């Protein structure tokens, strides 16, 4: 806190509580007793505990019938109207799409749809496999996830 | 039917004005003016001008007489105090309050 180390008034005789610093946390405009510093909130997650967690999540998605498996998932051109139409035909609104090769057209076509997300098999995260109502994985994706989890 | 006149931020402590305000509470306007006219207090001048304003308001705005009117409600609220420094002995300072009052006078026939 900006200010001098000057003792505001003499230790004894004034009849006021003894003061040492105008920066005392007891004082208005004073320091914060336990001032925060920038922190790293990151936690270590054991590799096996991460993979075992994904296995648990993907296994739940099957039993709750939230995992949909398709041979191929793509659109004609990078048009949001095309994907939007394909999702009201396949009968789901909020959905997470995992595909083998990150097709530029499908990525661009799902970018302005907030309820829809498009990623690769290597880009799956635990929160996104729970957050989204449904998860639509291509046949190639299941043959990339297995080999990545084992 | 009630008519209100206020002197807000009047230069006098609420204590001093209240002495004069207790003389005319519940009296007839004619009986109140006389009383204030021969009350030797600065506050008597202040409160007389509010009562006269109250009567004028009751004659012009809320079509009424000057015979039937009585001082139905009178009260004085503490206004904002002005803080001044008074130098005392041995370079010590006191903080003088110049107290102000809000003087409200209500007149009515009922």
């Amino acid at each position: 806190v900006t200010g001098s180390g000057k003792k505001p008034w003499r230790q004894k005789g004034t009849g006021r509580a003894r003061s040492g610093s105008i920066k005392s946390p007891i004082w208005r405009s004073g320091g914060v007793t336990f001032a925060a510093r920038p922190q790293d909130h990151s936690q270590k997650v054991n590799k096996k505990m991460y993979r075992g967690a994904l296995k648990s999540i993907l296994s739940e998605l099957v039993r709750q019938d939230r995992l949909i498996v398709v041979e191929k998932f793509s659109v004609e051109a990078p048009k949001t109207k095309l994907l939007a139409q394909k999702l009201k035909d396949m009968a789901l609104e909020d959905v997470l799409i995992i595909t083998g090769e990150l097709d530029e057209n499908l990525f661009l076509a799902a970018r302005n749809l907030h309820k829809v997300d498009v990623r690769d098999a290597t880009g799956i995260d635990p929160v996104s496999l729970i957050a989204f109502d449904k998860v639509v994985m291509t046949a190639d994706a299941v043959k990339q996830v297995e080999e990545m989890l084992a | 039917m009630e008519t209100i006149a206020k002197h807000r931020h009047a230069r006098s402590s609420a204590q001093k004005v209240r002495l004069v305000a207790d003389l005319i509470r519940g009296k007839k306007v004619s009986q109140a003016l006389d009383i204030l006219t021969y009350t030797n207090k600065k506050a008597a001048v202040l409160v007389k001008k509010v009562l006269e304003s109250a009567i004028a308001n009751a004659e012009h705005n809320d079509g009424a007489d000057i015979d039937d009117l009585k001082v139905t409600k009178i009260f004085v609220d503490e206004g904002p105090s002005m803080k001044r420094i008074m130098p005392r002995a041995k370079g010590r300072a006191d903080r003088i309050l110049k107290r102000t009052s809000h003087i409200t006078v209500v007149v009515s026939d009922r």
């Binding site: 008034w9 005789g13 004034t14 | -």
Partner: peptide
């Protein structure tokens, strides 16, 4: 709040000495 206290000023009487 409270104003900054004054530096020492002249005192009228000596503190009694008890000894």
């Amino acid at each position: 709040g409270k104003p900054r206290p004054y530096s020492p000023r002249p005192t009228s009487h000596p503190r009694p000495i008890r000894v």
